[PDB]
RNA sequence: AGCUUUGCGCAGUGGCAGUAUCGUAGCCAAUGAGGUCUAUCCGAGGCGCGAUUUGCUAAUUGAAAACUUCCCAAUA
């Protein structure tokens, strides 16, 4: 061994940069495994939730 | 001529909602169902059935919780 301490800290942060929740991370992993994404209503709900969260974070 | 009584039906408001609201279809019942007051007084409900139906929205779980295609790659 060369001799050092591992500087490893891995995570699952979405491509948008937001750190996916463990439930959200499991949902993303299951979507990737099943090869199927969110539906139209799911997309609308996600967009509304993201917009509300962004507006709350604004002020 | 203006108002108004039983008020009715429409629309708005307030409140109530398991004891209640109603059908009650089973039964008695304006040809009296019921009693400590009132008994030579009072006079229309009670026993049993079943629910409180119409829609919208958020969320919640799930891999997907639904409304007409889809994951992909250098560009335009």
Curated annotation (Swiss-Prot):
Where it sits in the cell: the answer is: Nucleus
Task: Recount the PTM note.
Answer: Sumoylated with SUMO2.
**Tissues and organs where the protein is expressed, per its UniProt entry:** Ubiquitously expressed.
Cross-link Glycyl lysine isopeptide (Lys-Gly) (interchain with G-Cter in SUMO2): where in chain: 9, 23, 49, 58
**What is this protein's function?**
Plays a role in mRNA splicing as a component of the U4/U6-U5 tri-snRNP, one of the building blocks of the spliceosome. May also bind to DNA.
According to its UniProt record, which protein family does this protein belong to?
A: Belongs to the SNU66/SART1 family.
Kindly state the subunit structure of this protein.
Identified in the spliceosome C complex. Component of the U4/U6-U5 tri-snRNP complex composed of the U4, U6 and U5 snRNAs and at least PRPF3, PRPF4, PRPF6, PRPF8, PRPF31, SNRNP200, TXNL4A, SNRNP40, DDX23, CD2BP2, PPIH, SNU13, EFTUD2, SART1 and USP39. Interacts with UBL5. Interacts with IVNS1ABP (via Kelch repeats).
Write down what this protein is called.
U4/U6.U5 tri-snRNP-associated protein 1
Q: Which organism is it from?
A: Homo sapiens
Q: What is the lineage of its organism?
A: Eukaryota, Metazoa, Chordata, Craniata, Vertebrata
In terms of the parent sequence, the fragment covers 701 to 759 of 800
């Amino acid at each position: 061994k060369d001799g050092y301490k591992p500087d490893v800290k891995i995570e699952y942060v979405d491509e948008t940069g937001r750190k996916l929740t463990p439930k959200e991370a499991f949902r993303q992993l299951s979507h990737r495994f099943h090869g199927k994404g969110s539906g139209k209503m799911k997309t609308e709900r996600r967009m509304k939730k993201l917009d509300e969260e962004a507006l709350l974070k604004k002020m």
